[PDB]
């Protein structure tokens, strides 16, 4: 209950302090009957300027800013995420390795630009109403919070999402898929321990059954169609495969809580390999178009599952 | 759980918010082995700029600064005050009037509005004051300093010093005095005398033939505390403090209470916890009316000399009681 905010970097400690502060503050704000237009233009800003006090892990001076806190708190609720757990995932231990992850791997913390923040504000209302409408059952990124950190006079923007991958299960194959032209992974990329394979890598070489294919493709058509309405493109389908048998060499094989690992789906019983898949849409912020991009994306993702 | 910080004035909302905030933050600072010189020069500053957010009770923009929070946390500890109790006494409901003399809703603590010179003086005296509080284990008639803050609302600064209440947080004061020992005239004004609970002075107590019946055990303890506190004040450049004296009539309270329950109809007793009401003395057994007194030294921040003022203070206050 004594929360030091020890971290590898001052910036991370400031993040921890900041989520802590803002989440607490929000625990002193009543959950409204509904969001109002102003909430979509609102923010909190804090400037800390301490002196000879509590400088073990935190800087003496810094700034923290949370964009649209009522909206993100409502999003958090809609995604079945308790403010307290969110807070604990950020504050109990330094987030880890620009893409970061909370120590418990539940949440991804992505550094962004000023333009991503603007874009976010631009789509936030429609995004929220869409989340409401789909009861949070979506394949889009699930945005949990958005922050601006000012450390040493240097502004850093962050967006917090639920992890596409399991927070426990090891991912054994990564693909990033646009359905696009053509693209592959490099010698530079095929070098890594975790290669980000691509469309050509995948087509060169997913078994969930026809009901799962139904619901997944349903979700996808609805999300990709929403993305085309907002006239967005160049996003991908992030796909990760956990090979159950490979991992076997408290515990639980291929075991996971689908209320937590939200994008996880298991192999059909008559699958060649015992496997768990993770599939979501990413990169929705920053000679074709949405209609063409959206529909092509759909064709491709469709001929990916059986 | 949901603390709204609702108040009569924005300034009070900021105070509630500020105490809540600083105590919470201190909850994430390890309590140390011994206070360091740095702790006596230290402070926390926070600037809040909320835009279209949380603006029902709080100002959108305000600043809160706490002076030397490690030291006042330690003082709180040495005075038997738990941080959470403190924080709750400030946040659960708005502090009430008695700026510039405020009380928490539960009558436990006093919030005084002070000058920047007063804050500066506190800083001059804080190390020695803390040392004294240490070597006397909190048993003192001096003001018991619990925190010191600067609030900024609409560009305007306000400084506050929080103290433990001299009076009981339950037992109601039926008559009060401010005593100095001043050979000079010390009298209550027609203004003050017209008030509901006038604050009487030296010649008011002398003329009224007032005396407080505590019996010698209580009296010796008290005179010993006073002697040491006043010598401590004289050690510094300190003079012109007063003895605040509150008198609570047990019977009179009983009557008031009776009238209350009797109104409700149509529409222990004189006891006190000495760990909470820290300046409180029961009337002696063989004493006229059953009273409870509250006696503390106040006003120590802002021809005769401080040593002399100290001995004279002490003599007058010896004579105040039997």
Swiss-Prot record, chain A:
<feature type="domain" description="PIPK">
    <location>
        <begin position="7"/>
        <end position="305"/>
    </location>
</feature>
<comment type="subunit">
    <text>Homodimer. Binds TNFRSF1A. Interacts with PIP4K2A; the interaction suppresses ubiquitination by the SPOP/CUL3 complex.</text>
</comment>
<feature type="region of interest" description="Required for interaction with PIP5K1A">
    <location>
        <begin position="33"/>
        <end position="39"/>
    </location>
</feature>
<dbReference type="GO" id="GO:0016309">
    <property type="term" value="F:1-phosphatidylinositol-5-phosphate 4-kinase activity"/>
</dbReference>
<comment type="function">
    <text>Participates in the biosynthesis of phosphatidylinositol 4,5-bisphosphate. Preferentially utilizes GTP, rather than ATP, for PI(5)P phosphorylation and its activity reflects changes in direct proportion to the physiological GTP concentration. Its GTP-sensing activity is critical for metabolic adaptation. PIP4Ks negatively regulate insulin signaling through a catalytic-independent mechanism. They interact with PIP5Ks and suppress PIP5K-mediated PtdIns(4,5)P2 synthesis and insulin-dependent conversion to PtdIns(3,4,5)P3.</text>
</comment>
<dbReference type="GO" id="GO:0007166">
    <property type="term" value="P:cell surface receptor signaling pathway"/>
</dbReference>
<feature type="binding site">
    <location>
        <position position="174"/>
    </location>
    <ligand>
        <name>ATP</name>
    </ligand>
</feature>
<keyword id="KW-0597">Phosphoprotein</keyword>
<feature type="binding site">
    <location>
        <begin position="162"/>
        <end position="164"/>
    </location>
    <ligand>
        <name>ATP</name>
    </ligand>
</feature>
<keyword id="KW-0342">GTP-binding</keyword>
<dbReference type="InterPro" id="IPR027483">
    <property type="entry name" value="PInositol-4-P-4/5-kinase_C_sf"/>
</dbReference>
<keyword id="KW-0808">Transferase</keyword>
<dbReference type="GO" id="GO:0005886">
    <property type="term" value="C:plasma membrane"/>
</dbReference>
<feature type="binding site">
    <location>
        <begin position="163"/>
        <end position="164"/>
    </location>
    <ligand>
        <name>GTP</name>
    </ligand>
</feature>
<feature type="binding site">
    <location>
        <position position="174"/>
    </location>
    <ligand>
        <name>GTP</name>
    </ligand>
</feature>
<dbReference type="GO" id="GO:0005524">
    <property type="term" value="F:ATP binding"/>
</dbReference>
<dbReference type="GO" id="GO:0042803">
    <property type="term" value="F:protein homodimerization activity"/>
</dbReference>
<dbReference type="GO" id="GO:0005654">
    <property type="term" value="C:nucleoplasm"/>
</dbReference>
<keyword id="KW-0472">Membrane</keyword>
<keyword id="KW-0963">Cytoplasm</keyword>
<protein>
    <recommendedName>
        <fullName>Phosphatidylinositol 5-phosphate 4-kinase type-2 beta</fullName>
        <ecNumber>2.7.1.149</ecNumber>
    </recommendedName>
</protein>
<dbReference type="GO" id="GO:0005789">
    <property type="term" value="C:endoplasmic reticulum membrane"/>
</dbReference>
<dbReference type="GO" id="GO:0046854">
    <property type="term" value="P:phosphatidylinositol phosphate biosynthetic process"/>
</dbReference>
<dbReference type="GO" id="GO:0005525">
    <property type="term" value="F:GTP binding"/>
</dbReference>
<keyword id="KW-1003">Cell membrane</keyword>
<keyword id="KW-0418">Kinase</keyword>
<keyword id="KW-0067">ATP-binding</keyword>
<dbReference type="GO" id="GO:0005634">
    <property type="term" value="C:nucleus"/>
</dbReference>
<dbReference type="GO" id="GO:0005776">
    <property type="term" value="C:autophagosome"/>
</dbReference>
<dbReference type="GO" id="GO:0061909">
    <property type="term" value="P:autophagosome-lysosome fusion"/>
</dbReference>
<feature type="modified residue" description="N6-acetyllysine">
    <location>
        <position position="63"/>
    </location>
</feature>
<keyword id="KW-0256">Endoplasmic reticulum</keyword>
<keyword id="KW-0539">Nucleus</keyword>
<dbReference type="InterPro" id="IPR002498">
    <property type="entry name" value="PInositol-4-P-4/5-kinase_core"/>
</dbReference>
<feature type="binding site">
    <location>
        <position position="283"/>
    </location>
    <ligand>
        <name>GTP</name>
    </ligand>
</feature>
<dbReference type="InterPro" id="IPR027484">
    <property type="entry name" value="PInositol-4-P-5-kinase_N"/>
</dbReference>
<dbReference type="GO" id="GO:0005829">
    <property type="term" value="C:cytosol"/>
</dbReference>
<dbReference type="Pfam" id="PF01504">
    <property type="entry name" value="PIP5K"/>
</dbReference>
<dbReference type="GO" id="GO:0010506">
    <property type="term" value="P:regulation of autophagy"/>
</dbReference>
<dbReference type="GO" id="GO:1902635">
    <property type="term" value="P:1-phosphatidyl-1D-myo-inositol 4,5-bisphosphate biosynthetic process"/>
</dbReference>
<dbReference type="GO" id="GO:0016308">
    <property type="term" value="F:1-phosphatidylinositol-4-phosphate 5-kinase activity"/>
</dbReference>
<keyword id="KW-0832">Ubl conjugation</keyword>
């Amino acid at each position: 209950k004594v929360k030091l905010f020890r971290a590898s970097e001052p910036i991370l400690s400031v993040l921890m302090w900041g989520v802590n502060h803002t989440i607490n503050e929000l625990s002193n704000v009543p959950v409204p009957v509904m969001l109002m237009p102003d909430d979509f233009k609102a923010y909190s800003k804090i400037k800390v300027d301490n002196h000879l006090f509590n400088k073990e892990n935190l800087p003496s001076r810094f700034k923290f800013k949370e964009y649209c806190p009522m909206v993100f708190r409502n999003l958090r609720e809609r995604f079945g995420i308790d403010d307290q757990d969110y807070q604990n995932s950020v504050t109990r231990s330094a987030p880890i390795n620009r893409f970061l992850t909370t120590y418990d791997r539940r949440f991804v913390i992505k550094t962004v630009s000023s333009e991503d923040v603007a874009e976010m504000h631009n789509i936030l209302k429609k995004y929220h109403q869409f989340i409401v409408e789909c009861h949070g059952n979506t394949l889009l990124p699930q945005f949990l919070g958005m922050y601006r950190l000012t450390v040493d006079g240097v502004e850093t923007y962050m967006v917090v999402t639920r992890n596409v991958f399991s927070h426990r299960l090891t991912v054994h194959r990564k693909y990033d898929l646009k359905g696009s032209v053509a693209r592959e992974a490099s010698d530079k990329e095929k070098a890594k321990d975790l290669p980000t394979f691509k469309d050509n890598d995948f087509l060169n070489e997913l078994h969930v059954g026809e009901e799962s294919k139904k619901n997944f493709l349903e979700k996808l058509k609805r999300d990709v169609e929403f993305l085309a309405q907002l006239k967005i493109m160049d996003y991908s389908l992030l796909v990760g495969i956990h090979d159950v048998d490979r991992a076997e060499q408290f515990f639980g094989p291929g075991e996971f809580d689908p209320s937590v690992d939200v994008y996880a789906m298991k192999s059909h019983e008559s699958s060649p390999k015992k496997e768990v898949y993770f599939m979501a849409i990413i990169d929705i912020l920053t000679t074709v178009n949405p209609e063409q991009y959206s529909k092509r994306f759909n064709e491709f993702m469709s001929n990916i599952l059986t």
